[PDB]
Amino acid sequence: ETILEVNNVPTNATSLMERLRFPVSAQAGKGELCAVFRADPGRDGPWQSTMLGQLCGYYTQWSGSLEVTFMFTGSFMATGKMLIAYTPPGGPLPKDRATAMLGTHVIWDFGLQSSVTLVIPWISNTHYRAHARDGVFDYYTTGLVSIWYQTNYVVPIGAPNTAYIIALAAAQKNFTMKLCKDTSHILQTASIQ
Amino acid sequence: DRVAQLTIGNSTITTQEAANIIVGYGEWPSYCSDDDATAVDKPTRPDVSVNRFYTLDTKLWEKSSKGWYWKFPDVLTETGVFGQNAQFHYLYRSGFCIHVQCNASKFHQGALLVAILPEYVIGTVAGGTGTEDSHPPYKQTQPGADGFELQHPYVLDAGIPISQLTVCPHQWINLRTNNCATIIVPYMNTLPFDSALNHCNFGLLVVPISPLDFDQGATPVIPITITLAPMCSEFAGLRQAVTQ
Amino acid sequence: DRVAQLTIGNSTITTQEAANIIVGYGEWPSYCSDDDATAVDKPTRPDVSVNRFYTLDTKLWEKSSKGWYWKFPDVLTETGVFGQNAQFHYLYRSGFCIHVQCNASKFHQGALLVAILPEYVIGTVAGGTGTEDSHPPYKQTQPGADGFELQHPYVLDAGIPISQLTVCPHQWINLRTNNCATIIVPYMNTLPFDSALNHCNFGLLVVPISPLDFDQGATPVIPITITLAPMCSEFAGLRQAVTQ
Amino acid sequence: DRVAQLTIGNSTITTQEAANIIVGYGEWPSYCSDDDATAVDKPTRPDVSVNRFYTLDTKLWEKSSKGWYWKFPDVLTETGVFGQNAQFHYLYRSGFCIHVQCNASKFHQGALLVAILPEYVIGTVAGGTGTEDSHPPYKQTQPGADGFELQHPYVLDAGIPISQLTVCPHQWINLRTNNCATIIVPYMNTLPFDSALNHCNFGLLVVPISPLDFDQGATPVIPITITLAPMCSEFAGLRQAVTQ
Amino acid sequence: HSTAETTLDSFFSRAGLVGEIDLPLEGTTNPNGYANWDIDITGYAQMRRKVELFTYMRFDAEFTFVACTPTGQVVPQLLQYMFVPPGAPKPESRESLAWQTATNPSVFVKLTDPPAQVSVPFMSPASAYQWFYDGYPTFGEHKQEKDLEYGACPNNMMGTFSVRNVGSSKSKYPLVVRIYMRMKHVRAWIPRPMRNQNYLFKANPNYAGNSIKPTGTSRTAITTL
Question: Chain E contact for B139, CB < 8 A?
Fold first, then answer.
């Protein structure tokens, strides 16, 4: 597992270190949306920060289940329950929690065990998937992941009202890749001196 | 004994501050006998697709809350595959595993009474004076998944004392002790099967007997979430989908 | 051998003038092997609720009819519980038992060729001259349950001879001999599962090779009804319902 | 499993909120084989006098800290009898038991990534524009026991992503879970022995991935202490003491 | 110490008033020598409060009919009581054809004879009677005008009890018939909180919202008796 940049928003020079974790905080209690991202490993997005995403770049096709572990880095006094859902292909980005919960999901309860693992089971029509891109190759999309507030981030007086979550992603034991190719990017502009 | 896990269908509930499990009237949900039945058509027992945990809306516990209630066959009639079967079939039958969850901190305090009241018929204040024979509206007798709030909890909005509500399968959520209540209810009715639309076998009552309290600075938002799972669901008398 | 009964699900078909049963490519429908599969999620096998006989629209055989066709996964996508599963799930897999029925009298005559053409891709007349690269509309490539009528049966609207259509699982309905055709088709595709919406595994063709004829006075309305039942249906990749 | 004790030499470490122990690359430190060696002189294996816990400086974790690093053979070259042997001998070899400790309270929060990066070569910002071939000073490549602070933790000051730093023996210190990290590292190099002065086998990185936070009133000083013990230390090629 | 007197039979097997029918000479209440009492034991507080301690109840019963004039005077008059199950024709007059009782059970007694007594079985199509039915008897829209049906369970509606002067002319005396019921072979399920407020109507638990009294007695201070 390597850190998954779910919060791939900040591009500022001083704010690069904050793409490594996303916020969670006290809400209004209406199952608010927390974060969202495509589950596609070899696609431009959050997975590009992971070792898995990088190694994928060297192979045309992959197959297997993926897993994402979320670690809560709030304080010991902070409590809460989240609902991480995985929406297989065809399902548009769920508009609300009541829609997201209809797919593969897991209700996460914060406690002594800081992390929880969302397994993105291999649910495909084809035996292998080529890298998904916008357009026609979106045929190989894996689906969407979305974190919702099951209940709410609760905290006492004296404890921070905002905490962060760090997502770590990797592949399962049934993961396989085939057909070597070059990564989409070449880290060089002019001749290297 | 303080920790527990409830797995049914493709859903799992976890808890580390439980207070055992109550089995209403000492009976586990079961299917209908061949001698207790009348409907001759073979029923549908969808199993895993309907016997799983459904999490309904969340309520906010305030220092001034009075309490809420949910009628049961009802709360689920418009949710998941259970709802579809309840709409397509005339007859329905099933037990339930109710798990009310509410956590706070070691510095918050309060006690909720979580009880199951069979045939929970709602009454009205009768125009205040008691001379007007008014009746509770559909929105109040069958509130759906959003539940409904009690206006006069002392009499359970039905002219009966809440102090005796403990003669019914119940459990308490005392913040200094546990953060959830689990009650398993068997199918209770004078008939082997009945309509999931017209009849509500029982009602779930969550009422604050000891007010919530804490010092300013501790998180003020304390939710109460209701999760419930049907058990041994059976449906019969198939036709088109009916909403009510 | 002339009489037969096909029972599957809660539906039964009867016939007293049949001509045996054809099993496409000598293989019965079966479920997907554990080594032929890729999707890792556990599939749904609804059985009796989807593997039953569905009777689609009826067509009228006229002395001038050209023929009709139905794309298969398609014809059922908006019918019964099969349709619901086909809409809610990304992946679908199944075989079919097709029973085309058409009866007349001992004084009527005519012969229908009932065949199954896998991957039945439709072509266009290319603007007549053949210089315009036009394509068949959605209404024609996937006609639904109403089927679609052939404009140029000789070439099956795809530039291929109908005279050779018999290299495909087929059967004939010769009014002086039988009044129905039964064909059992296994799941055929280069993938273990596929979308029931975007892909049509095969097409059912019903074409009059020998024109219908009779003397004035004999009932002139001779219908052709299509009844079909999925077999070994499996679905996977659950999500919300998608129509197309 | 949450409690542990590490005794080696005349030093003992205690902990009641640990998270198991990591053994780098699944290998325990060991002495050099007779077939992996080249230096013919008999080495010194001082044992208890050098294989013990040395506690280096303490760092202060601030809500804005970026992270620090320590090069290892180095941090100890001027401390205790280990340092003396490292100075008097040309060749050195050994594994390490690293124990990073940092405690807070049940009301503080934050997460430190404690990792071991072999051959941790430091790069420079190249004058900002990237046209100047500048190099890191001795004070930065070999910071000694005081460690050095990271200027650009995202790229580990070496143009490589910290998000992938977990492919190296690591452990986290999540204040709500544990208050220390223990990593055991074997001798890793392409040579059986090497200079403890010119070469640094690996670097210890302690970086805040989830910022430290707490409410005003809770103690604001949260230290991070580094304790480490050599293991299976061997030295050879004796001469006079050399500092660098 | 025995626990026998607290069994359900000991508790409920005691006849109590559940009905009262008036057959006056002149008035606006059954002045034609006949009356139709809708069988409902929910018209009197004592008997009602006891049974409403349970939600469901299955039992046989013993009905006793005490008849006399409004002064308690025993008069030489012949009466006819008839049980009219739901669906049977309810008598519209003293000389109604329905009094032929070719099939309905009837009792002919003189007020000079000891009170008529009879045994009744458990005649509900349900497995037990419900003192509380949280629902509606029919489907459809439930508008304001029909809220009258909420809580009405037909499985508890056993029919009508009819009385008349066995004759074709006006009776010479004013009559009253008190109906007592004694339960036998009792089964009961699901206990509930006991009635707290005064009863107002038969088919429902309505209470006077402006006169909501405490369950019991009150005092000045919590630290003083």
Answer: no
CA distance from start to end of chain C: 42
Chain A residue at shortest CA distance from C92: A125
Structural domain including E79 reads 1-225
In one-letter notation, the amino acid at residue D39 is: A
CB of D99 within 8 A of CB of D53?
yes
Contacting partners of chain A (3+ CB pairs under 8 A): B, C, D
- Measured on CA atoms in the order E65, E68, E74, E75, is the torsion positive or negative? negative
Q: At residue B130, what are phi and psi to the nearest 5 degrees?
A: 95, 15
Q: For chain D, which residues make up each domain, given as ranges? A: 1-244
Kindly write down the DSSP assignment for every residue of B62-104, as one continuous string: -TT---EEEEHHHHTTTSHHHHHHHHHEEEEEEEEEEEEE---
Q: How was this structure determined?
A: cryo-EM
Q: How far is CA C112 from CA C67, C181, C185, in A?
A: 9, 10, 19
CATH topology of domain C1-244: Jelly Rolls (2.60.120)
Q: What is the set of domains in chain A, with CATH numbers? A: 1-193 (2.60.120.20)
- Interface touch A76/D105, C-beta < 8 Å: yes
DSSP-derived 3-state class of residue D175: coil
Shortest distance between the Cα of B141 and any Cα of chain E, in A, equals 8
Please tell me what resolution, in angstroms, this structure has. Answer: 16.0
Question: Are E78 and E131 contacting, i.e. CB atoms less than 8 angstroms apart?
Answer: no
Q: CB contact, 8 Å: C84 with chain A?
A: no
Rounded Cα distance between E72 and A128, Å, is 97
Up-side HSE of residue E152: CA atoms within 13 Å toward CB? 12
Query: Which residues of A lie closer than 8 Å to B, measured between beta carbons?
Result: 26-27, 29, 31, 77, 79, 81, 101-102, 107, 109, 111-112, 150-159
In chain A, what residues touch D215 (CB-CB under 8 Å)? 157-160
Residues of A at the C interface, defined by Cβ within 8 angstroms: 63-65, 87-92, 99, 102-104, 121-128, 174
Question: How many domains is chain E partitioned into structurally?
Answer: 1
Select the residue of A90, A125, A126 nearest C239 (Cβ to Cβ).
A90
Beta-sheet pairing, B180-185 with B22-23? parallel
CA distance E87 to E90: 9
Q: Minimal Cα–Cα distance from A89 to chain C, Å?
A: 7
With CB atoms and an 8 Å threshold, state whether A121 touches C38.
no
Nearest to D75 by CA among D202, D191, D168, D161: D202
Q: List the 180-239 stretch of B: residues with Cβ below 8 A of E.
A: 188, 190-191, 197-200
CATH of the domain at E69: 2.60.120.20
Number of helices (H) and strands (E), helices first, in chain C?
Answer: 3, 12
Look at the block and give the residue holding tokens 């065809």.
Answer: A90
Kindly report the backbone phi and psi dihedral angles of residue C75, in degrees, each rounded to the nearest multiple of 5, phi listed first: -45, -25
Amino acid at position E111, single letter:
L
Q: Please, do chains D and A touch (3+ CB pairs < 8 Å)?
A: yes
- Residue indicated by tokens 């005064």: E198
Inform me whether the C-beta atom of residue C38 falls under 8 Å from chain A C-beta atoms. Answer: yes
**Alpha-carbon distance E200 to B131, whole Å?**
9
List strands edge to edge, sheet with A176-180: A129-130, A59-63, A176-180
Strands, DSSP E only, in A52-181?
59-63, 66-72, 81-87, 104-109, 115-120, 129-130, 144-149, 162-171, 176-180
* C-alpha count within 13 angstroms, C-beta hemisphere, residue B62: 9
- Backbone φ and ψ for B59, nearest 5 degrees, come out as -115, 155
User: How far does CA B4 lie from the centroid of its chain?
Assistant: 20
Nearest to A151 among B58, B80, B107 (CB): B58
Cα distance between residue D61 and residue E23, in whole Å = 96
